[PDB]
Amino acid sequence: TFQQAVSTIVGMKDEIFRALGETFVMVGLSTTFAVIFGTLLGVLLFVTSSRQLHYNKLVNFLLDNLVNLMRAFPFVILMIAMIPATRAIVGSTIGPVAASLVLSVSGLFYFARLVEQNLREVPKGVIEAAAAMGAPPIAIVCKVLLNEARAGMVSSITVLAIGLLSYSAAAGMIGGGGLGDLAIRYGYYRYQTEVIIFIVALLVLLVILIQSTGNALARKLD
Amino acid sequence: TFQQAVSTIVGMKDEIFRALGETFVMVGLSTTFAVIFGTLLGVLLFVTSSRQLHYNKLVNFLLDNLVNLMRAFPFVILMIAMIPATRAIVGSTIGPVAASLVLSVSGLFYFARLVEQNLREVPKGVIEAAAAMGAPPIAIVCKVLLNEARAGMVSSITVLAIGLLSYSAAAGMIGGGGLGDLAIRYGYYRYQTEVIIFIVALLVLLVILIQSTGNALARKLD
C-alpha cells in the first residue's frame, strides 16, 4: 500500500491543490450568475402563463421553446462552437474563467426550468385568494409565490450545482482546468491506477457533501 | 461566400456520412440494452417499496442509494476509469461499439430512475382493488401496473434517447464517435466556420424529430 500513498502525496500534492483550486472557481462563479439570471427568466416563463399576474400566449410560447432547445442541446458541442464568442468576452480561449462563461450560459437556461417547475406546484387557490384582496401583481409574486416555493428552490440549486460539476469535467479536456484536465493526463495517455482511484474517491465524497448540505437546509426552511 | 461555403461541404461528403452512420451506432445500440435492463431494475425498486411481492427495506435502501450515486457520478471520468474493463469485453477501446457499451451502462441507471418515477404515479387505490380481487403480485406488475403507466413510458424513452445523444459527443473526443469526433477537428485544432453551422443545424433537426415523434406516440396511447 505504501507505493500508492507515497506516489500520491509527494508529486500530486503539487498538482491536486491546483486542480481543486481550478474546479471550485469554475463551478462557484458560474452557479452564482445562473441562480441570479435563471430566477428572473423563470419568473417570466410563469407570469405570462397565469391568466392573473399577466397573460401573453406568444411570449410564453417563444420563451418555452427557446428554453427547451437550449436545455436539449449537447453542452460540449455548444462550447466548441462558441470558442470565438468566449474568446471575445473573456479575452482568452483557455482558463477556468473562460470555461466559466459557457457554463453560466448553459446553467442560466438550466435553472430557468427548475424555478418554473417549483412555482407551478404552488396551489392555484393561494393565487386566487391573494387576488381576492386586491394584491398588486408585483406583490403577489413577491409575497406569495417566492415565499411558498421557498423550500423548493434550495433543492433546485442543489441539482444545478451537481449538474455544473459534471459539465466542468468535460470542459477541462477541450479547454482548461479541473480534475477533467488531470484525468486525461493519467487516464487517456499513461493509464495509471493509484491516481485514478484517488480522483474517483474525492468526487464521491464531494458529491455526498453538497447533497447533504442541500437537503438539510431545504428541510429546515420547509 | 455562399457558393464557396456550399462547395466546401460537398467536399466532405464521405466524412460527414461516416460521422452520422457512426453516431447512430452509438445511440441506437445502447438504448436497447438500457430499456431492457433499466425496466427490470426499476420494477425491482418499485416492488420493494410497496406491499407487492415484498416490502424489503434493506434492499430498497441499497438499490435507491446505488442509482442516485451512479447518476451523480461524472460521465467523462467514468469512461476514462473504465478503459481496461471496456477494452477487455469488446477486445478494443477505440471505436463506436466499445463506447456504446459505456453508454448502455449509464443508460440502465437513468432509465430505472425514470421508470420508478413513472410507476410511483399510478393511484394506490386501483392497486388496492387488484389485491381485493385475489390477483398474485406478478399479476399486479403485469396487468394492473403496465396498462396504467404505458402512456408515460414512451415519454421516458424519448427523454432517454436525447440524454444519450449528449453523452455521445463527450465520447467523441476519445472514441471517435461520429459527430463528436467531427466537432473536435474543424472546430478546435482549426475553425472551419461553414462546417460548424452545418453540425449545429443537423443536431437541431435531430432533436426536433425525436421530440416530435415521442410526443405523438405518447399522446396516441393514453
Add this chain to the structure above:
Amino acid sequence: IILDKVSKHYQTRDKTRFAAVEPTSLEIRDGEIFGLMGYSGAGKSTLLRLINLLERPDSGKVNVCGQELTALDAAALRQARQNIGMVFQQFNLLSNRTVADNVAFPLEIAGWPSEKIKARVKECLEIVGLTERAGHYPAQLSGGQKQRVGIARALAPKPQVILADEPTSALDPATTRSVLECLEDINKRFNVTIVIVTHEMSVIRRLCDRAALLDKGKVVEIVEVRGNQIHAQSDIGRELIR
C-alpha cells in the same frame, strides 16, 4: 348589492370546473343572508365569482355598494375587491406563515400602520375564539380551526360584504354547527350581508333569510327560508327542496 343583468359562457379548451350562466338579475338586501342553491352544474359558484367580478361577465352590469364595478380601471378595482371578504371550500391559506400572519396579510396590503395591524388581529382571533393558537402554523390545525381562521382573515379589513364558497362542504356535523354559529354572530353584531353557495337544502334551513334555486345556469325561483320552511310554487323548485 344588485346585478342589473349578467352572463358568462366559457369557451371550450378552457375545460374549467365551472359551468356557463345565463341572463340573471338579483338584489341581495342590506344586512340579509342570501343563499345560492342548486345541484353541481347549476352555476352557483360561477355566479358568486361574477359579484367580486373575478370572472368578468360577457355582458351586463354589477353594482356593489354604489360603485359600478364593470367599468372600473384595475387600480380602483383593487379597492372594490378589498371591500368584499371571501372564504373558500379548500381553505386556501398560506402555509409558511403563522395563524396571526394570515389574518394580518390583507391589512398589510391596505398599507395599514403596523401597530394598528397588531391591534385588529388580536381582536379578530378574539371573535373566532382562536387566540391561543396565534403562534401555531396552518399545518397543525384541524379542518374546523382552519375555517375559523379563514373567517377572521375575511373580517379583518372591516368589509361590508362577505362571499362564501361552500365552506362547510368538507366538515362533519359536529364542527359544522360551531362554524355556522360564527356567521350568525358576525351578521348580528356587524351587518356584513353574507352570500353563500351550497348544494344542500339542510344548511339553508339553519342560516338563510331568502334563497335562489339554480337550474342549468338560470334561477327558477326565489324562496323564503325565514319562515324556517322552504316553499316552492314551481316544479323544479319543489324537486331541489326535497
Add this chain to the structure above:
Amino acid sequence: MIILDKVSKHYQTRDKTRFAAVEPTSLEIRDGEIFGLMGYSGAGKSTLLRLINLLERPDSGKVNVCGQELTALDAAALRQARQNIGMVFQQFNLLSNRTVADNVAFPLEIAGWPSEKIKARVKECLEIVGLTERAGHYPAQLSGGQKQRVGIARALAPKPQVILADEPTSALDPATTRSVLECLEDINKRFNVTIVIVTHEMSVIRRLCDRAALLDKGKVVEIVEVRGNQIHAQSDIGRELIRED
C-alpha cells in the same frame, strides 16, 4: 355471516396513514340482513371494514368469514377466499386505459374462466345495473353515478356472497345517490348478503339499513335496528350521533 372476535389495530407513532386505530370489538353480522358502521371524522370504521378482508392485519383475535378462520390461512389459500368477498370503493378505483366491458371482465379473467362464459357474465351483470348501453366507452367518458354502477357491476361479477362498501355515495349529489342505493336494493334480491356500507352520515343509514352500529374513537357504543326509517337510540353518547337525522 362474518363473526369477529377481540380484533384490534394500532399504528406506529409515525401515523402515516389516514386510517384510525380500532380497540377490542366483537361483531356478528347475520346471513339474512344488511349492516352499517356509523361514525365520524376519525372514529375507527374504515379500518374495521378492511379488517374483514385482511387488507389490514389485526394484532389480536380471530377474523372468521363464511366459516373459514382467515388469519389461519396465511397463504395462497387466502387469495382464493377473497374471491367470495367483493368490494366497492368511495373514489371509483377503475382502470382507466380499458373499456368498461373489460373493467367488468377483469375479476372473471383473474379467476381463470374461459372467455365464452366471461362474455355472458359481462353481458348479464352489466345489464342488471342498466349500463349495457355504454359497454364500449372509457372511464373518462362517464359520470360519477355511472362509475359507481361500474364498481357494483365489477364487485358482482365473481358472484360474491358478501359485498363490502366503503362510503360509496357520499360524494354523489342526491339525484345520483337515490339511483345508486336503488341498485343495491336490486342486488339484495339475489343471494348477496351482508352488504356492509360504511358512512359518515345518517341519510344513507335510515334508507336501506336493517341494523346499524355506532362508535366513539374505536369503541362500538351501541348497535340499533332501523325500522320504519327511524333509529330510537338507547345509548347516551349515542344520542348525539343520531341527531344527524
